[PDB]
Structure 1
Amino acid sequence: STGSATTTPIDSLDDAYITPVQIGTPAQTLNLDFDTGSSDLWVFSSETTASEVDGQTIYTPSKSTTAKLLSGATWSISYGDGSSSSGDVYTDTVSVGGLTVTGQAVESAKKVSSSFTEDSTIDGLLGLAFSTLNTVSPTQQKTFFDNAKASLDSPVFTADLGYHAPGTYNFGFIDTTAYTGSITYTAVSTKQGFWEWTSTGYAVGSGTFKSTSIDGIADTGTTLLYLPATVVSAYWAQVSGAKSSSSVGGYVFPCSATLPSFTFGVGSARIVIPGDYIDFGPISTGSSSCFGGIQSSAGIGINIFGDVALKAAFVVFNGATTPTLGFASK
């Protein structure tokens, strides 16, 4: 079987993408953030503290005839930006774009951090990293992808994120009309639970390509591109008036500047990120300083190929027994 769902940016800056997901019987439709950097499916629910809910659609297990409480199970997660949530665990039927999984662990949030409460358009997260990172205790739970793998025509899903436009998550098949040229596959390390791979280098604008190994993770759940300080410094040195601002927390640049493109290597192939993709707009309303989409990973400890990079490509997440990542131009 296969599934296909449209994913839509939540705002004009492509800060995140939401995808409708049907949970329960009868279906309750929630808009979830598909996150290849985590492995928990958690949702705002009728059990969430009422003061921590501001406009989200909530999952109500008591209205689902297929929901079962997973006796004694709890979950607690903390994200790399400081966000967190926790609660109890149900099992229920979950469908994405026509692809149905029965008995999926649905983690019901009793408490959410402030950053989720303020994001009225995100009803939860759907983790698509490896199941070793799932936080359910005492019995670890499988991701939606892991549960669907058996029945999929092919054990893959693909991410086709749009620039200021809707995109597509496909499960079980590779749409050969969605990209140009060939797909270049590269090896994945699963030792930390992430879709971790090694980029073969980079170039700034029309500059020379610098062959150098950059280990990082493919993370649809992270907005920006986080790279080593040496790389990020070489990029922003080409932007007149750009500087690192401690008060803002990263590189900013004059909103009137035009940004160079950024190229990253995948094996022998090259993925080009247009300079417009790196503009994340004024740091405050009316400001003439704009926030950069390429930032240093020094404070984070891991390099992150977030949405800024992934939306420049067609990305195949190949969950075969030897997993690989595929990149193609589009």
Structure 2
Amino acid sequence: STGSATTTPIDSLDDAYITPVQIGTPAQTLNLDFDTGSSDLWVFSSETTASEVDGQTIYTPSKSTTAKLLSGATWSISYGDGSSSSGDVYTDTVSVGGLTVTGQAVESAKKVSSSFTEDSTIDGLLGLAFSTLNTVSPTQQKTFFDNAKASLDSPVFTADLGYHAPGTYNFGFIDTTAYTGSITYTAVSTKQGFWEWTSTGYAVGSGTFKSTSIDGIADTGTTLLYLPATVVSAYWAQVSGAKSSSSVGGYVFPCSATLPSFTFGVGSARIVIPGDYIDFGPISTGSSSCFGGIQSSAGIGINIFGDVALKAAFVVFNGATTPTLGFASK
């Protein structure tokens, strides 16, 4: 089997991407944030505290003839931005772009934090990291990909995110028309439950390539590119007037600037992030200070190749017995 679904930016800045997902019988379509940095599929639901729902589409398990309570199971998760959610669990039929998994754990939110409530466009999360990170207790549950894997033509999925445009998530096949040149594959460590890999270095604009190992994760659920402070400083030093603002929460730059590109290494290959991809616009409406798309990972504990990096590439998440990551230009 295979699946193919379009993923769409939630706003003009590509702050996140949503992908339609069919849950239950008859189908209830929710727009979920596909997140290769976590491993829970959770949704706004008929069980979500009413005051914490503001415009989201909800899953109502009582209206699904294939829904079954996963008796006694609960979940609770917190993310890198301090957001959180928790609740109980149903199993139900879940389909993504024509690919169907029966008995998928669908985690129903009883509570969500303010950032989720305020995000009217995101109806929940679909985790695509390794199932070892799944938070369901007392019986840990498998991700949609984990469940689908054996049935797939190939045990892979791909992320093809657009810059200020829709893109594609494919399951079970590699679309050879979707990228240019070749795909460079690189080793993955699953020790922390992430798609963790080691970049071979970086360049700023037309500058020389710096060969240096940068361990990080491929994370579609993180908006920006988070790298060591040394690397981030070298980038922003090439933008006149750019500076780190503790009050704003990171590097800002004059909205009048032209941003340089940023290159990262994948083995001997190179992925070039155009300067425009690194612009996240005025810090507040009308401001002439703009927020940067490359930020320090210093206060995170891990480097994160988020959407800013991934959208510059065609990315293969290879879930073979020995997992690997592939990157191609496009």
Q: Is TM > 0.5 for Structure 1 vs Structure 2?
A: yes
How far 1:316 moved relative to its partner? Answer: 0.2
Partner deviation per Cα, 1:270-296 (whole Å, 9 max, x = no partner): 000000000000001110000000000
State the percentage of identical aligned residues. Answer: 100
User: Which residue of the partner structure matches residue 73 of structure 1?
Assistant: 73
User: Which residue of the partner structure matches residue 265 of structure 1?
Assistant: 265
Partner deviation per Cα, 1:35-86 (whole Å, 9 max, x = no partner): 0000000000000000000000000000000000011000000001100000
User: How many residue pairs are counted as aligned between the two chains?
Assistant: 330
**What are the equivalent positions in structure 2 for 1:289-308 lying under 5 Å apart?**
289-308=289-308
SS at match of 1:18: strand
Structure 2: which 5+ residue stretches go unaligned?
none
Partner deviation per Cα, 1:112-168 (whole Å, 9 max, x = no partner): 000000000000000000000000000000000000001000000000000000000
What is the CA RMSD across the aligned residues, in angstroms? Answer: 0.3
Partner deviation per Cα, 1:92-125 (whole Å, 9 max, x = no partner): 0000000000000000000000000000000000
SS at match of 2:270: strand
CA distance in 2, matches of 1:33, 1:103: 20
How far 1:305 moved relative to its partner? Answer: 0.1
TM-score scaled by structure 2?
A: 1.00
How far 1:199 moved relative to its partner? Answer: 0.1
Structure 1: which 5+ residue stretches go unaligned?
none
CA distance in 1, matches of 2:228, 2:191: 21
CA distance in 1, matches of 2:243, 2:94: 46
CA distance in 2, matches of 1:293, 1:141: 34
CA distance in 2, matches of 1:308, 1:288: 21
SS at match of 1:110: strand
How far 1:313 moved relative to its partner? Answer: 0.2
CA distance in 2, matches of 1:29, 1:284: 33
CA distance in 2, matches of 1:313, 1:142: 27
CA distance in 2, matches of 1:190, 1:33: 22
How far 1:329 moved relative to its partner? Answer: 0.3
How far 1:217 moved relative to its partner? Answer: 0.1
How far 1:11 moved relative to its partner? Answer: 0.1
CA distance in 2, matches of 1:151, 1:285: 48
How far 1:210 moved relative to its partner? Answer: 0.3
User: Which residue of the partner structure matches residue 156 of structure 1?
Assistant: 156
SS at match of 2:4: strand
User: Which residue of the partner structure matches residue 55 of structure 1?
Assistant: 55
How far 1:12 moved relative to its partner? Answer: 0.1
Partner deviation per Cα, 1:206-237 (whole Å, 9 max, x = no partner): 00100000000000000000000000000000
User: Which residue of the partner structure matches residue 313 of structure 1?
Assistant: 313
**What are the equivalent positions in structure 2 for 1:180-259 lying under 5 Å apart?**
180-259=180-259
**What are the equivalent positions in structure 2 for 1:1-20 lying under 5 Å apart?**
1-20=1-20
CA distance in 1, matches of 2:244, 2:175: 41
Give the ranges of 4+ consecutive aligned residues of structure 1 lying more than 6 Å apart after TM superposition. Answer: none
SS at match of 2:104: strand
CA distance in 2, matches of 1:147, 1:286: 47
How far 1:7 moved relative to its partner? Answer: 0.3
How far 1:20 moved relative to its partner? Answer: 0.2
